[PDB]
């Protein structure tokens, strides 16, 4: 086993894992659609109820047993060993669209290396059609079919989505995005080449630039005409909509996929920690840091929105209707092209996006690699770099389908379905296992003998009452509500829902298959097999 080394390494790695690309455009948007200033209370409630205890439990499991995601079950619950393969499949499905969004951001950064930004005027080969929507104009030329040159640069030059008719017509592959994905994957391979020490060394700088970048973005957007409108519209308490459950479900899913428990990353990260560490303080600090980073990201996004609304003389909640990764590459691109320092600020913002994506990518890939290597110790002598290269090649082959012209449809499909009930039921199975199958008393005794004190009664009752019920509530809310996805001028067909359900079930289906395999492979009667499937084996 290898040691993290310095204390800052593990903290920076967990911070870069928690602070992802999702919390910069999705969190402020769903906070706007859900109350606004009144969205903070349910956010922190759902956090302290089901994201902080899960984070603490996962960190304690990773630090105590010192294993990945396939060998911990060998020590707590052998019947739930398929969670490792489920985590691998989920992480591959996530890494596909994550790396393709990283490639989009890298291509934007490369195209933002000129004096004049290419998404500024409507004189290019990609800015072809409707271009009445502009900035710094007294004439009000409003059209129901109009658009902006930035959306044309995004959808016709970067994505080239006009060369496809939807999910049913996927043809051609953009070579520029392919080269961007290749360069990004080489960077990833060189970042987790040797092991966790080089990963921490790259995170030391990759997880630090976004913070000063957000500081610069805040001090720029604060000194903009009309940002106060966006500020007061983001911090507008609307308790009338808080009566429904949709705001609660959105806040719960947001804090879950932001903190990221049950993804198989915290276990491997804490596997290298020392036995005399303090995982509670680390978990609390990283959770508060991720929450504050989400807050500042929403703040700068809404200041940009308010400045653009003031300079456009248009009400809020209409300039950024479309969600997804396009929100940034359209709205923030227009705002930067409107700013005097366009090239520098665009380069800075795209470097921030690249670093935020790379942090989570490194975290997930290292977690998967550690989970696989902890299960098969015989492939750790002279197969580490080979397995890392194989994982990178598999991720590249999985993202190749999203790197097409109409690939953005598959990207949204993966971002909306892979981040669905699969991770939720994985975390639920883990929680109920540690609670009943492994025993909450034994877990508390392990936490006491590891740190030096047992956790308070709050976490003890929470892990057994709230977090499993909270995850089950999210599951039953996501199951009976099929998402109605819609990209730019395209409604998803009915078979898209079936494909999303299939790709979300194929990752979860590993657990019951492994349960059946374990129940058949061991001799004895039924109850004897059940008993043998819960009690851990001898070391």
């Amino acid at each position, epitope marked *: 086993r290898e040691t993290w080394g310095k204390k800052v390494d593990f903290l920076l790695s967990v911070i870069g894992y928690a602070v992802d690309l999702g919390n910069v455009w999705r969190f402020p948007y769903i906070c706007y659609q859900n109350g606004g200033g009144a969205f903070l209370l349910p956010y922190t409630i759902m956090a302290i109820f089901g994201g902080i205890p899960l984070f603490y439990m996962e960190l304690a499991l990773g630090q105590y047993h010192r294993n990945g995601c396939i060998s911990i079950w060998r020590k707590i619950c052998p019947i739930f060993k398929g969670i490792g393969y489920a985590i691998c499949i989920i992480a591959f499905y996530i890494a596909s669209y994550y790396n393709t969004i990283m490639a989009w951001a890298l291509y934007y950064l490369i195209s933002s290396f000129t004096d004049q930004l290419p998404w500024t005027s409507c004189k290019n080969s*990609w800015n072809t059609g409707n271009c009445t929507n502009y900035f710094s104009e007294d004439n009000i030329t409003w059209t129901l079919h109009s658009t902006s040159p930035a959306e044309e640069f995004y959808t016709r030059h970067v994505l080239q989505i006009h*060369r496809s008719k939807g999910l049913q017509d996927l043809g051609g592959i953009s070579w520029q995005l392919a080269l961007c994905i290749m360069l990004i994957f080489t960077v990833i391979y060189f970042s987790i080449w040797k092991g966790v020490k080089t990963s921490g060394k790259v995170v030391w700088v990759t997880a630090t630039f976004p913070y000063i970048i957000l500081s610069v973005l805040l001090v720029r957007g604060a000194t903009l005409p009309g940002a106060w409108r966006g500020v007061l519209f983001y911090l507008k308490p609307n308790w009338q909509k808080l009566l429904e459950t949709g705001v609660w479900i959105d806040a719960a899913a947001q804090i879950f996929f932001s903190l990221g428990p049950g993804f198989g990353v915290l276990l491997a990260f804490a596997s290298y920690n020392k036995f005399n560490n303090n995982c509670y303080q680390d978990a609390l600090v990283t959770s508060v840091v991720n929450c504050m980073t989400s807050f500042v990201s929403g703040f700068v996004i809404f200041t940009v929105l308010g400045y653009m609304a003031e300079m456009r003389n248009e009400d809020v909640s209409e300039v950024a209707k479309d969600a997804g990764p396009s929100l940034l590459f359209i709205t923030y691109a227009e705002a930067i092209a409107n700013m005097p320092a366009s090239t520098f600020f665009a380069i800075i913002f795209f470097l921030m996006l690249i670093t935020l994506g790379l942090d989570s990518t490194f975290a997930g890939l290292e977690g998967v690699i550690t989970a696989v290597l902890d299960e098969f110790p015989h492939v750790w002598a002279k197969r580490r770099e080979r397995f890392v290269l194989a994982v990178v090649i598999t991720c590249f082959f999985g993202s190749l389908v999203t790197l097409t012209f109409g690939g953005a449809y598959v990207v949204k499909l993966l971002e909306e379905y892979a981040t669905g009930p699969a991770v939720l039921t994985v975390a639920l199975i883990e929680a109920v296992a540690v609670s009943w199958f492994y025993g909450i008393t034994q877990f508390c005794r392990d936490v006491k003998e590891m740190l030096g004190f047992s956790p308070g009664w709050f976490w003890r009752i929470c892990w057994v009452a709230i977090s499993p019920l909270f995850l089950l509530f999210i599951i039953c809310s996501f199951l009976m509500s099929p998402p109605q996805l819609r990209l730019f001028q395209y409604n998803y067909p009915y078979w898209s829902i079936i494909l999303g359900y299939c790709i979300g079930t194929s990752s979860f289906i590993c657990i019951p298959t492994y349960i059946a395999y374990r129940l058949i492979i061991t001799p004895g009667t039924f109850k004897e097999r059940i008993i043998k499937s819960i009690t851990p084996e001898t070391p």
Partner: antibody
Amino acid sequence: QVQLQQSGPELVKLGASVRISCKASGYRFSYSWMNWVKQRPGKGLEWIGRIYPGDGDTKYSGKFKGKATLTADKSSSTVYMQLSSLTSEDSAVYFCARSAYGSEGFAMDYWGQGTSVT
Amino acid sequence: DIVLTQSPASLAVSLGQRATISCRASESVDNYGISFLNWFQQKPGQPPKLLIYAASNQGSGVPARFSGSGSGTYFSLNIHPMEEDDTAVYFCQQTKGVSWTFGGGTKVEI
């Protein structure tokens, strides 16, 4: 409806300078390129250069890089062309073709009557 | 700078037949799915008139007899059936983002 009204013809002089205008009307003047071509008597067309009145970006292909000056005027929707070092080779008919959008491949569909510089 | 070589230099076919005008570009003019190559037509004493844009779609007031096709670095202009009103000079201009240059021009007679 799009109509590009061009000026009348002028007289070429050795070492002088001529300014040919093109009064475009009927479309978004600041959202479409305004190209210029050269048709010598008895020979084919010769592209001069384009100018985008939205921001004033001008392009040139060949020899007309340092002798042709394209200026835009959004107030009156008129594009000018300042020719310099007028020789016997510049005695041709300079048209004013409005390029289409990108989906149409920048099609120069609407042209002018041409000013025969004799 | 992308040069264009039109073939042949002169064309002379009877009425009612099919006239084929080729235009081989030096480089590729397709980058965003659409072709950046147009076809024009001019008569003695008349400014040029656009016939087909993007080498696939026809103009506004152009008859259906001017059918265009081709992609990549080879394009064709089909005029069938042609009459005594289609005897003019047909050019081939590309609109690539590096330079917009014209072709050679084919004087179709008869």
